[PDB]
């Protein structure tokens, strides 16, 4: 039903709130180890899932993204191991700590957020990550996955609950039914704390319309960008384009725009660019500047913003770095932006100039999924300007509290006739 889930979440919050790290650490340890042994189960489950998906036949890249292979499995295992290793100081670690007056202390401890309602596209590999995140931050979690991996989702939840069997708190993680339950649950506020819809434009809007006294954070858009200039190895440019647009064609952070310094169009590098783009079979487009530049050129574009989410692209030429920054800040979505150059001056210039959630010099637009940032398992990427930037790791799921204990103080003791005066020194935290 509806409020039974809410009360189970509150019970999990109360339990994990009084569960010392000794419990949850071993909990995610067993989660990993059990994900290693019984993986054949979830393997065949996701096999059936992708089989029935292909039988339905939505779209080949989507079939690739909802797929699953032992490689990602071992990667998730070692990532959760890293989390468990470095999660002993999540809830309870002090951030600030001072001493205002004589015999009066003030600190700022971390604190669980409570109940989160995460929504996310099929992406069956995420469920273990997000569940490990909740179990490691000791906050109630509700789930909702795409109907595609439904069986795989249920299997993974069987896994995480057989893991929870060692701690007894069998409620902090749950599943839900179709979006009707999601609506009626988002309605019953005063029991939820955040909503993390991992990728939905219209559904970001819908949650907003249904966000009655409840915050929202996630990512609704991901238009990345790349750039090259007169001081970059052609080979590095080629292979970076390859890595960027040919690992997960349409996951979250695949670039869909190229930018070139006009003094490199004569260098025929555009030729090899299209050569490799066609060796991978990608229908490049172009916009105003290039579409004028060439004899008659590849076909025209519509809007430099439209995300395509498949083996497509767009190429424009820019007169100068200034135009590059203007173009990025005016068309991008501050998701993840790259460059390639040898002149370190232009490098730091572009780094400090652009504003995106990620900036990269001589690297790939693919390095943004938290895991490859050594952050361990994560929930998504944040485009917004509050509470996080980029991969929302653990620390993106924790807020602060001001506990303040004294002997006998008051407000007037600091007035004109008071007997104690401020110090405002920051003692070394424990
Ligand atoms: N930035 C990128 O590179 C990139 C790439 C691919 C996808 N994405 C994001 O992922 C989305 C793709 O669609 P999706 O089906 O895969 O999203 P989803 O995570 O599967 O969410 C379920 C879908 O049901 C629909 N709906 C109506 N009411 C809903 C409710 N209360 N709760 C949940 N869903 C409700 C939503 O819109 P629909 O009916 O239209 O699905 C929603 O997309 C896109 O909107 C996009 O934001 C981003």
From TrEMBL:
<feature type="binding site">
    <location>
        <position position="201"/>
    </location>
    <ligand>
        <name>NADP(+)</name>
    </ligand>
</feature>
<dbReference type="GO" id="GO:0004349">
    <property type="term" value="F:glutamate 5-kinase activity"/>
</dbReference>
<keyword id="KW-0511">Multifunctional enzyme</keyword>
<comment type="pathway">
    <text>Amino-acid biosynthesis; L-proline biosynthesis; L-glutamate 5-semialdehyde from L-glutamate: step 1/2.</text>
</comment>
<keyword id="KW-0641">Proline biosynthesis</keyword>
<keyword id="KW-0547">Nucleotide-binding</keyword>
<keyword id="KW-0418">Kinase</keyword>
<dbReference type="GO" id="GO:0005524">
    <property type="term" value="F:ATP binding"/>
</dbReference>
<feature type="binding site">
    <location>
        <position position="220"/>
    </location>
    <ligand>
        <name>NADP(+)</name>
    </ligand>
</feature>
<comment type="pathway">
    <text>Amino-acid biosynthesis; L-proline biosynthesis; L-glutamate 5-semialdehyde from L-glutamate: step 2/2.</text>
</comment>
<dbReference type="GO" id="GO:0055129">
    <property type="term" value="P:L-proline biosynthetic process"/>
</dbReference>
<comment type="similarity">
    <text>In the N-terminal section; belongs to the glutamate 5-kinase family.</text>
</comment>
<dbReference type="GO" id="GO:0004350">
    <property type="term" value="F:glutamate-5-semialdehyde dehydrogenase activity"/>
</dbReference>
<keyword id="KW-0028">Amino-acid biosynthesis</keyword>
<feature type="domain" description="Aldehyde dehydrogenase">
    <location>
        <begin position="1"/>
        <end position="302"/>
    </location>
</feature>
<dbReference type="GO" id="GO:0005739">
    <property type="term" value="C:mitochondrion"/>
</dbReference>
<keyword id="KW-0808">Transferase</keyword>
<keyword id="KW-0067">ATP-binding</keyword>
<protein>
    <recommendedName>
        <fullName>Delta-1-pyrroline-5-carboxylate synthase</fullName>
        <ecNumber>2.7.2.11</ecNumber>
        <ecNumber>1.2.1.41</ecNumber>
    </recommendedName>
</protein>
<comment type="similarity">
    <text>In the C-terminal section; belongs to the gamma-glutamyl phosphate reductase family.</text>
</comment>
<keyword id="KW-0560">Oxidoreductase</keyword>
<keyword id="KW-0521">NADP</keyword>
<feature type="binding site">
    <location>
        <position position="179"/>
    </location>
    <ligand>
        <name>NADP(+)</name>
    </ligand>
</feature>
<dbReference type="GO" id="GO:0005759">
    <property type="term" value="C:mitochondrial matrix"/>
</dbReference>
